[PDB]
């Protein structure tokens, strides 16, 4: 589910 800092948690 959860991959990177660059990306909103949202997505």
């Amino acid at each position: 589910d959860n991959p990177a800092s660059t990306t909103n948690k949202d997505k």
Partner: antibody
Amino acid sequence: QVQLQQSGAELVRPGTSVKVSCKASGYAFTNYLIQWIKQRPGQGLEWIGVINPGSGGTDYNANFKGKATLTADKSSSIVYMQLSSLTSDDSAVYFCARDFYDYDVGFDYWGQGTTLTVSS
Amino acid sequence: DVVMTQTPLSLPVSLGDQASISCSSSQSLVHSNGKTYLHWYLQKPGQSPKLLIYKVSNRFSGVPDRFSGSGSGTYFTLKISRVEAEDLGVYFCSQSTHVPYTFGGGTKLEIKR
């Protein structure tokens, strides 16, 4: 009072490199992703990259991989863009904008844009 | 890349009348989590772009009810209900569902006094 504040305006020799800065004040720096966009002057915008200041995490457009390199200073809330190996084509306006981290809800508030004129 | 497309390239409009910018995408802009993330922006001449509508239909703060976004999946249109002088500019549509984040071409709203 949320202000993103940019470096200025620069004349650069081709082959040279530049550190444009984007300085944030008024908000929690690390609650938002800083995004860098290019614009050649009378045309559309294009994305150049993403840095998350609190974690140091950088992502780039493939057209900019290895030209752009984004770095942020936590000690004093500035984010940077280093454009390596300049050429005629990098003359443009480069903005930066804030993107909320927990929720994408647009590119919120943008800086003024640094105008960078590459020339001999 | 999610080839973004706006029409018209330019839009001659008169003070008080309706105006309707339209933007269409190559991919479905609805990201797995269920949210269409198409945003609309205004760049007044010389200023830097400002956000108008953020997830397809919801307006950013202090943004007149004359503006409304609307659309689905690959088709989104923007509307100005009674054009005013302050709406001079280029309107950008952009997606942030898919990296690279791409922007539209821009429609040049021209007032016709």
